[PDB]
Amino acid sequence: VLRDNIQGITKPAIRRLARRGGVKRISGLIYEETRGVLKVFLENVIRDAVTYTEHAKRKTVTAMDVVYALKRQGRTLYGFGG
Amino acid sequence: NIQGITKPAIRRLARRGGVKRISGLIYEETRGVLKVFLENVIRDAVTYTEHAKRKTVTAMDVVYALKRQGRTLYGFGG
Amino acid sequence: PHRYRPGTVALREIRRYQKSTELLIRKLPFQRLVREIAQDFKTDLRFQSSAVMALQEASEAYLVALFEDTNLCAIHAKRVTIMPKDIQLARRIRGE
Amino acid sequence: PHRYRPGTVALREIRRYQKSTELLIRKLPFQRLVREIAQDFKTDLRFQSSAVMALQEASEAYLVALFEDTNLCAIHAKRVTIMPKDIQLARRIRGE
Amino acid sequence: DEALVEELANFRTLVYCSLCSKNWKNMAIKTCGHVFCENCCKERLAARMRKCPTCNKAFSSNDLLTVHL
Amino acid sequence: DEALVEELANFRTLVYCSLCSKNWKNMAIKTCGHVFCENCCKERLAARMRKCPTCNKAFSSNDLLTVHL
Amino acid sequence: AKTRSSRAGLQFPVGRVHRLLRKGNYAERVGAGAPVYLAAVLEYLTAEILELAGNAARDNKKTRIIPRHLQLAVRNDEELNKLLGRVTIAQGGVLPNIQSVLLPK
Amino acid sequence: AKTRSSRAGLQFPVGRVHRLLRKGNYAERVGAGAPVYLAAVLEYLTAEILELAGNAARDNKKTRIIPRHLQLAVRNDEELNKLLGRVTIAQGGVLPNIQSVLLP
Amino acid sequence: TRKESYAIYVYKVLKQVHPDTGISSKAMSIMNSFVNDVFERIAGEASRLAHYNKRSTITSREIQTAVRLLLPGELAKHAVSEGTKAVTKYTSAK
Amino acid sequence: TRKESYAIYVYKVLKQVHPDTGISSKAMSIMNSFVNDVFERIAGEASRLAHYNKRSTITSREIQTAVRLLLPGELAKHAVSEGTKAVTKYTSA
DNA sequence: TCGAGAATCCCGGTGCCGAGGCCGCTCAATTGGTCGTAGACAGCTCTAGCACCGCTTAAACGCACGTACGCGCTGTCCCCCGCGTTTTAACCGCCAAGGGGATTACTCCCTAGTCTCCAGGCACGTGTCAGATATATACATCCGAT
DNA sequence: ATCGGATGTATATATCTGACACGTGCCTGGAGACTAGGGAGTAATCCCCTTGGCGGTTAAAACGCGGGGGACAGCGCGTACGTGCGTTTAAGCGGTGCTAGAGCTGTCTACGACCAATTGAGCGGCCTCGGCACCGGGATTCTCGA
Ligand SMILES: [Zn+2]
Ligand SMILES: [Zn+2]
Ligand SMILES: [Zn+2]
Ligand SMILES: [Zn+2]
Concatenated DSSP letters of J27-87? HHHHHHHHHHHHHHHHHHHHHHHHHHTT--EE-HHHHHHHHHTTS-THHHHHHHHHHHHHH
Please give the C-alpha separations between residue A1 and each of A38, D35, D42, D74, E9, in angstroms, as whole numbers.
21, 10, 13, 41, 47
Instruction: Tell me, in angstroms, the distance from the centre of ligand 2 to residue F8's CA.
Output: 27
Chains H and D touch (3+ CB pairs under 8 A): yes
> B37-41 contacts: CB < 8 A, separation 24 or more?
B37/C59, B37/C62, B38/C33, B38/C34, B38/C37, B38/C55, B38/C59, B39/C37, B40/B69, B41/B65, B41/B66, B41/B69, B41/C55, B41/C58
F39: CA distance to ligand 4 center in Å? 17
Question: Which residues in chain B have their CB less than 8 angstroms from residue J61's CB?
Answer: 51
Give the Cα separation of C15 and D28 in Å (integer): 56
* Torsion sign, CA atoms F16, F19, F20, F26: negative
H77 contacts H58 by C-beta, under 8 angstroms: no
| CB-defined contacts C:D, below 8 A | 33
H or E element, residue F28: strand F27-29
Taking CB atoms within 8 Å and a gap of at least 24, the contacts of J70-75 are J70/H83, J70/J41, J70/J42, J70/J45, J71/H83, J72/H79, J72/H82, J72/H83, J73/H79, J74/H79, J75/H45, J75/H48, J75/H79, J75/H83
Dihedral angle computed from the Cα positions of residues A12, A15, A21 and A27, in that order, rounded to the nearest 10 degrees: 180
Q: Which of H25, H28, H29 to mutate to test the interface with G (most CBs of G within 10 A)?
A: H25
Compute the C-alpha angle A71/A75/A81, nearest 5°.
Answer: 55
Angle between helices D49-76 and C84-94 (to 10 degrees): 180
> Which residue, among A39, I63, I76, A52, has the nearest Cα to D45 in the 3D structure?
A52
Which phi and psi angles does C14 have, rounded to 5°? -60, -45
* CA dist list (Å): C26 to B66, C29, C33, C53: 22, 6, 11, 12
The set of chains that have 3 or more CB pairs under 8 A with E is: F, G, I
Length of chain E: 69
Q: How many domains does chain B have?
A: 1
Q: Which ligand is nearest to the CA of F32?
A: 4
How close D90 comes to chain A (CA, Å)? Answer: 12
d(CA I28, CA I40): 19
Q: Is any atom of strand K within 7 angstroms of residue J57's beta carbon?
A: yes
**Quick check: I72 contacting G, CB < 8 Å?**
yes
Domains of chain D: 1-96 (1.10.20.10)
In chain D, positions 42-81 with C-beta closer than 7 Å to nucleic chain K are 46-49, 78-81
Which of C63, C60, C14 is closest to G97 using CA atoms?
C14
Within 8 A by CB and 6+ apart from F58, the residues are F31, F50, F51, F52
H vs B contact (3+ beta-carbon pairs below 8 A):
no
Resolution value, angstrom units: 3.5
Torsion angles phi and psi, residue D80, rounded to 5? -125, -20
Q: Is the CB of C19 under 7 A from strand K?
A: no
Residues 6 or more apart whose Cβ sits within 8 Å of residue D9: none
List chain G residues with CB under 8 Å of I65.
none
F3 CA to L132 C1' distance (Å):
64
Chain H: give the shortest CA distance to residue A1, in Å.
32
Residues of chain H with Cβ-Cβ distance to I47 below 8 Å are 25
**Domains of chain G from N-terminus onward:** 1-105 (1.10.20.10)
End-to-end CA distance of chain H: 71
Bridge partners for E64 per DSSP: E29
How far out from the chain centre does Cα F3 lie? 27
CA-angle at E35, arms to E29 and E41, nearest 5°: 70
Burial class (CB in 10 A: 0-12, 13-18, 19+), I61: middle
- Number of CB pairs < 8 Å for D and H? 29
HSE, side-chain direction, 13 A CA sphere, residue G98: 17
**Would the CB atoms of F4 and E7 count as touching at under 8 Å?**
no
Domain that holds residue A45: 1-80
Q: Distance (Å, rounded) from C-alpha E20 to C-alpha E25? A: 10
Chains with 3+ CB–CB pairs under 8 A to D are A, C, H
- CATH number of the structural domain spanning residue B62: 1.10.20.10
**In this structure, what CATH number is given to the domain that contains residue J11?**
1.10.20.10
Q: How many residues does chain D have?
A: 96
Positive or negative, the CA dihedral G53, G58, G59, G61 is positive
Number of domains within chain I: 1
CA quadruple D23, D24, D26, D30: dihedral positive or negative? negative
Q: In Å, what is the CA distance from I43 to each residue of A23, B73, J15? A: 45, 20, 44
> In Å, how far is I2's CA from the nearest CA of chain E?
39
- Flag whether residue D84 sits within 8 Å of chain C, measured between CB atoms: no
**G-proximal residues of I, 17-36, CB under 8 Å:** 17-18, 20-24, 26-27, 30-31, 34-35
C58 has a chain G CB within 8 A of its CB = yes
Which residues of chain E have a CB within 8 Å of the CB of I78?
48
Whole-number Cα distances in Å, G23 to D46, D89, G18, G92, I33: 40, 47, 9, 34, 19
Which nucleotide comes closest to C29 if you measure CA to C1'?
Answer: K90
Residue at shortest CA–C1' distance from K120: H3
Whole-number Å distance between alpha carbons of F61 and H75: 64
Rounded (10°) angle between helices I74-91 and I60-70: 160
Question: CA J9, CA F28: separation in Å to the nearest integer?
Answer: 80
Q: Which of B10, B4, B32 is nearest to B22 (CA)?
A: B10
Q: Give the bases of strand K that a protein CB approaches within 7 Å.
A: 5-8, 18-20, 27-31, 38-39, 48-50, 59-61, 66-71, 79-84, 89-91, 99-103, 110-112, 119-123, 130-131, 142-144
Say how far apart CA E67 and CA A30 lie, in whole Å: 38
| Nearest nucleotide by C1' position to the A62 CA atom | L102
Q: Which of D73, D76, D83, D96 to mutate against chain C (most C CBs within 10 Å)? A: D76
**CA B14 – CA B2 distance, rounded (Å):** 18
* Closest residue in chain E to residue F63, using alpha carbons only: E30
Cα E25-E30-E35 angle, rounded to 5 deg: 15
CA distance J49 to J71: 16
Query: Which helix or strand (DSSP H or E) is residue H44 part of?
Result: helix H34-58
Nearest CA among E29, E38, E33 for reference residue E63: E29
Chain E CA closest to residue I77: E47
Q: What is the CATH number of domain E2-66?
A: 3.30.40.10
CA nearest neighbour of I42 among H26, G52, H52, G37 = G37
Bridge partner list, G29: I57
Contact flag, residue C45 CB and nucleic strand K, below 7 A = no
Q: How far apart are CA B42 and CA C34, in angstroms?
A: 8
Give the separation between CA J19 and CA D25, rounded to whole angstroms: 39
The environment of the single-atom ion ligand 2, i.e. residues with CB closer than 5 A, is E 32, 34, 52, 54-55
The distance of D85 to chain C (nearest Cα, Å) reads 9
H88/A75 Cβ within 8 A: yes
Identify the three-state secondary structure at position A33: helix
CA distances (Å), origin D55, targets A44, A62, A66, D87, H3: 12, 11, 7, 23, 43
**Long-range CB contacts (within 8 A, 24+) of J62-67:** J62/H34, J63/H34, J63/H37, J63/H38, J63/H41, J64/H37, J65/B47, J65/B51, J66/J42, J67/H41, J67/J42
Do residues I77 and G51 lie in contact, with contact meaning Cβ atoms separated by under 8 Å? no
Q: Nearest residue to K99, CA vs C1'?
A: B55
Task: Determine if strand K comes within 7 Å of the CB of G6.
Answer: no
Q: Where are the beta strands (DSSP E) in chain A?
A: 25-26, 60-61, 76-78
**Given an 8 Å threshold on Cβ–Cβ distance, is C18 in contact with G93?**
yes
Interface test with B, best of J64, J69, J77 (most B CBs within 10 A): J69
Within 8 A by CB and 6+ apart from E48, the residues are I74, I78
Contact status, residue I43 vs residue G21, Cβ threshold 8 Å: yes
Taking the centre of ligand 3 as the mean of its atom positions, its distance from the CA of residue F11, in whole angstroms, is 16
